[PDB]
Design an enzyme around this catalytic site. Structure first.
Site, PDB file in Angstrom:
ATOM      1  N   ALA A 106       0.811  -1.213   0.000  1.00 58.48           N
ATOM      2  CA  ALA A 106       0.000   0.000   0.000  1.00 58.48           C
ATOM      3  C   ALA A 106       0.845   1.265   0.000  1.00 58.48           C
ATOM      4  O   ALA A 106       0.340   2.336  -0.349  1.00 58.48           O
ATOM      5  CB  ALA A 106      -0.937   0.007   1.208  1.00 58.48           C
ATOM      6  N   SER A 107       2.118   1.167   0.388  1.00 61.59           N
ATOM      7  CA  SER A 107       3.032   2.299   0.337  1.00 61.59           C
ATOM      8  C   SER A 107       3.646   2.515  -1.041  1.00 61.59           C
ATOM      9  O   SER A 107       4.276   3.553  -1.265  1.00 61.59           O
ATOM     10  CB  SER A 107       4.145   2.110   1.372  1.00 61.59           C
ATOM     11  OG  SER A 107       4.866   0.914   1.122  1.00 61.59           O
ATOM     12  N   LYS A 163      -8.778  -0.943 -21.042  1.00 67.98           N
ATOM     13  CA  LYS A 163      -9.154   0.246 -21.797  1.00 67.98           C
ATOM     14  C   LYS A 163     -10.419  -0.001 -22.616  1.00 67.98           C
ATOM     15  O   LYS A 163     -10.655  -1.105 -23.118  1.00 67.98           O
ATOM     16  CB  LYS A 163      -8.020   0.680 -22.725  1.00 67.98           C
ATOM     17  CG  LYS A 163      -6.692   0.901 -22.029  1.00 67.98           C
ATOM     18  CD  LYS A 163      -5.694   1.603 -22.937  1.00 67.98           C
ATOM     19  CE  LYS A 163      -4.375   1.825 -22.221  1.00 67.98           C
ATOM     20  NZ  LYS A 163      -4.587   2.331 -20.832  1.00 67.98           N
ATOM     21  N   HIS A 170       1.526  -5.256 -23.957  1.00 70.31           N
ATOM     22  CA  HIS A 170       0.388  -4.408 -24.310  1.00 70.31           C
ATOM     23  C   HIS A 170       0.017  -4.555 -25.783  1.00 70.31           C
ATOM     24  O   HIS A 170      -1.144  -4.813 -26.119  1.00 70.31           O
ATOM     25  CB  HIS A 170       0.688  -2.947 -23.977  1.00 70.31           C
ATOM     26  CG  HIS A 170       0.923  -2.692 -22.522  1.00 70.31           C
ATOM     27  ND1 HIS A 170       0.289  -3.405 -21.528  1.00 70.31           N
ATOM     28  CD2 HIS A 170       1.715  -1.792 -21.894  1.00 70.31           C
ATOM     29  CE1 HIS A 170       0.689  -2.961 -20.350  1.00 70.31           C
ATOM     30  NE2 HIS A 170       1.554  -1.983 -20.543  1.00 70.31           N
ATOM     31  N   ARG A 186      -8.050   4.448 -32.475  1.00 72.57           N
ATOM     32  CA  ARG A 186      -7.105   5.197 -31.657  1.00 72.57           C
ATOM     33  C   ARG A 186      -7.514   5.135 -30.191  1.00 72.57           C
ATOM     34  O   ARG A 186      -8.688   5.322 -29.864  1.00 72.57           O
ATOM     35  CB  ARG A 186      -7.014   6.654 -32.121  1.00 72.57           C
ATOM     36  CG  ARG A 186      -5.907   7.437 -31.432  1.00 72.57           C
ATOM     37  CD  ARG A 186      -5.702   8.808 -32.057  1.00 72.57           C
ATOM     38  NE  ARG A 186      -6.791   9.730 -31.759  1.00 72.57           N
ATOM     39  CZ  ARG A 186      -7.577  10.283 -32.674  1.00 72.57           C
ATOM     40  NH1 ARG A 186      -7.423  10.028 -33.963  1.00 72.57           N
ATOM     41  NH2 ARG A 186      -8.535  11.120 -32.285  1.00 72.57           N
ATOM     42  N   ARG A 207      10.578  11.445 -35.382  1.00 69.14           N
ATOM     43  CA  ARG A 207       9.800  10.223 -35.535  1.00 69.14           C
ATOM     44  C   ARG A 207      10.566   8.973 -35.118  1.00 69.14           C
ATOM     45  O   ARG A 207       9.941   7.937 -34.864  1.00 69.14           O
ATOM     46  CB  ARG A 207       9.328  10.065 -36.982  1.00 69.14           C
ATOM     47  CG  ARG A 207       8.186  10.986 -37.376  1.00 69.14           C
ATOM     48  CD  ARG A 207       7.752  10.720 -38.809  1.00 69.14           C
ATOM     49  NE  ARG A 207       7.511   9.301 -39.045  1.00 69.14           N
ATOM     50  CZ  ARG A 207       6.348   8.694 -38.847  1.00 69.14           C
ATOM     51  NH1 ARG A 207       5.288   9.358 -38.417  1.00 69.14           N
ATOM     52  NH2 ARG A 207       6.247   7.390 -39.086  1.00 69.14           N
TER      53      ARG A 207
END
Ligand SMILES: [Cl-]
Ligand SMILES: [Cl-]
Lengths: 486, 485
Positions: free
Chosen positions: B24-25, B198, B256, B382, B468
């Protein structure tokens, strides 16, 4: 103001150009033809020294006043294009005469030859375009007179623009084409269906055939049903006697909606050549069997309840006991490999709930894994009142969801007078958006047997109040054809 | 100011519920976990008498001060949902102890049992959820202690949430799963890839499989190439020493983007059941051959020259002579009937021209009749910075044109993650969590290349921060079959 940036190609600026608007005194010439020519001038789509001749029976001693009191009365965009009214009227000349006497056109030939000789350039032959803003009864008479006394000099072409209606059934339409055949061939005849000048109608070809997304989807494997709709809130507005001889099917369905259907349903042309496109339209229309009375629902509007709109039979100019339909929903069968089994519905109606012209394509359900949690995708193309194209799809419900079956329906939305487009096409020799003779005959044969049955009384319209959707049987007919209304 | 409508079902109100946040810290607990729990409370997605225990090694005698300076610091929507901050902190308890000592967890069990006994209801057997917001070295130690001293009464479930990273290659990841197998099985382990929380990522399944329009198009007959992109403007921001051992591939691509890849490319599940969906992710990833060193372009960002964003090697925590890539573009081959021959490009880069996460699907040209007058359609999804889905198509140029060849390109535009994942874990829905076999197959795709990078067989290409990336990367994309739009 605006400086005129001539968009005309250099090849079109070398020879004299004459546009002869027969029936220049008529309603269509001054409400649609001349305003379109004026808009073409402002857009720079007219060659630098074009000649525009207003042919009419009525003589007007006001050569320069008629041009300024009746012609610009029905002009538009006068808050931004007023700067060029006079330079455009500089190109406009007036010529009086009959529409069917050969010598009256020999006089026009020398009068136009006077204008052709005044052109800046060596070539004096000149191209000649005739716009027949005349009743259909005068088309054959005018065409013969033009051929016999007003052909262009050796060189420049001749094109004749004729507008609807071309008869009222297969026989009458074929006899009008029979009368015009001796005088001009298909390469010189430009039949106008003004829906072919509309932006959304012209975009059907590009949407379907320039995009892999639409190309791969546009067949019976993925499409469940197609509907093409014409809806108007107004009624006959007192001219019911004029409408009673036409009916809703002849007025908008046999010509306007069927033209949209051909572009929606035809095969891909190998190139964008005008005649390859028209070949595919004709080839598509030949796959359609004649519409039987079991594939149709007719209606005739009654009063608007609020009294605002009276009944069609409550009009004195309408003969009593009239079987003329002001509403119609028709089911068509396209017998080929792309469309076999796919219902096509043409819907048109006056005095209905809204003013609306649109195409609705329903795709088949994706049955698994979502089932009742999904609905059929749709492609919608709207022409009137506001242009639009959007896809209706099923998407996850926004926010915290307990399971993937929580969905909602969403949309993917896309982000010039017809005569202007059609007249410029005729000037450049592009017949893509004009009705070919064989296309006209095949289109008539689809609807004619039903039209004869309606006139014989074999079909009775169903009364419906003005302002409603139409007969309830019409909506049941649509659902029974395979449409899922949501 | 608003009230709270509890959307919790009656089935979730029958037993005590306890959520124990180990660490929790830590940064994650107070930046992501506790703010998500607070949002779940405000949205009414927590049962009325839930207990939240903050487990940590650091001792805090002022338990009520810890709640107000380090827990609520990273709370949000405090101008409209502050009405319930204090009522929410009433549900929060603090417990100090180690993460690997068995007796420290026997104390927690009696402490939690005290909260379970105080429940309003006959049933006192509580469901227990453990959130391991801990470094990876503590995962095995914590899991063993929980099984040995903190199991629920024989009436309530137990679920353990584990965070990234799960190893750093195939071998290390498999040993971590091997160590946890004795203590809990797959139905009790919830491995978090926060991209699966998401909205746009979750919407991929519904977009693909609820719609005939996308279903009929989603194959190699119509798709020319697929790109999945992660872009960030910032660099390591002083934390390069922690990043240097990870690299861009392990940080965002192996997990991801590969999760996005799996949902984009998998076959249709037979049902929307959680395990059918995960079966298809695993089945897809088994069709991907390991990435060779010929299918990649690496980069390492230098000083931006814009008076900010210093170079990557200009960070003291970064070891000198580091070959760690901050940029990578990878080409994947999916060997099955849906995707054979379709190039898949994964792009990720820190310190680049914009902040951006999106999917770009390029369709094949419709060659005739428009030819050069038409461009390849694209579907774009997107996620960052702004959610969007749009289709790029060719349409006739508006207005009076000379020919149909006068065209223009137009668009058909559609008109927190830890909160979603924690709510899913509370309901026992494992759809958006990484299964054990899914983790191993994904590692096998990237591991042979990662070893080559660590051995030095691949050298990153320097690029200025804010650009880029390496020029060779964009040429690599063009040679792969992509047409720039
Ligand atoms: Cl709608
Ligand atoms: Cl874009």
């Amino acid at each position: 103001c605006e400086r005129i940036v001539s968009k005309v190609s250099e090849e079109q600026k070398r020879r004299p150009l004459t546009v002869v608007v027969l029936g220049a005194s008529g309603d269509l010439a001054k409400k649609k033809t001349f305003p379109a020519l004026f808009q073409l001038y402002c857009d720079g789509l007219l060659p630098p020294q074009i000649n525009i001749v207003g042919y009419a029976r009525t003589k007007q001693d006001d050569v320069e006043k008629w041009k300024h009191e009746t012609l610009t009365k029905y002009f538009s965009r006068l808050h931004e294009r007023s700067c060029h009214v006079e330079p455009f009227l500089k190109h406009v000349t007036y010529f009086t005469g009959s529409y069917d006497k050969k010598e009256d056109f020999q006089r026009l030939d020398e009068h136009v030859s006077k204008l052709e000789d005044a052109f800046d350039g060596e070539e004096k032959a000149g191209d000649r375009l005739f716009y027949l803003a005349l009743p259909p009864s005068a088309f054959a008479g005018a065409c013969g007179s033009i051929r016999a006394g007003a052909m262009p000099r050796e060189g420049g072409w001749i094109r004749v623009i004729i507008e609807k209606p071309f008869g009222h059934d297969t026989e009458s339409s074929a006899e009008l084409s029979k009368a015009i055949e001796p005088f001009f061939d298909e390469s010189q005849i430009y039949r106008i269906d003004h829906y072919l000048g509309k932006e959304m109608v012209q975009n059907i070809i590009t949407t379907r055939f320039a995009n892999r997304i639409f190309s791969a989807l546009w067949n019976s494997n993925n499409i469940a049903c197609v509907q093409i709709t014409f809806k108007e809130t107004i009624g006959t507005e007192g001219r019911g006697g004029y409408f009673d001889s036409i009916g809703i099917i002849r007025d908008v369905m046999q010509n306007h909606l069927t033209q949209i259907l051909a572009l929606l349903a035809m095969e891909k042309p190998n190139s964008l050549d005008a005649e390859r496109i028209r070949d595919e339209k004709v080839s598509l229309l030949k796959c359609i069997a004649p519409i039987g009375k079991d594939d149709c629902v007719l209606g005739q509007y009654t009063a608007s309840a609020d009294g605002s709109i009276p009944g069609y039979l409550e009009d004195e100019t309408v003969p009593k006991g009239s079987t003329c339909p002001t509403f119609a929903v028709l089911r068509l069968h396209i017998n080929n490999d792309r469309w076999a089994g796919v219902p096509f519905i043409l819907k048109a109606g006056k005095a209905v709930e809204q003013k609306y012209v649109a195409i609705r394509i329903q795709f088949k359900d994706e049955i698994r894994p979502y089932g009742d949690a999904a609905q059929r995708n749709e492609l919608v193309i709207r022409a009137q009142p506001s242009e639009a194209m959007y896809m209706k799809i099923t998407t996850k419900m926004p926010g915290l969801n307990e399971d993937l079956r929580e969905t909602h329906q969403t949309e993917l939305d896309l982000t010039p007078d017809a005569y202007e487009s059609l007249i410029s096409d005729a000037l450049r020799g592009n017949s893509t958006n004009f009705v070919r003779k064989d296309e006209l005959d095949v289109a008539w044969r689809i609807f004619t047997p039903l039209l004869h049955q309606i006139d014989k009384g074999e079909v009775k319209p169903i009364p419906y109040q003005a302002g409603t959707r139409g007969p309830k049987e019409a909506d049941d007919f649509i659902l029974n054809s395979g449409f899922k209304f949501q």
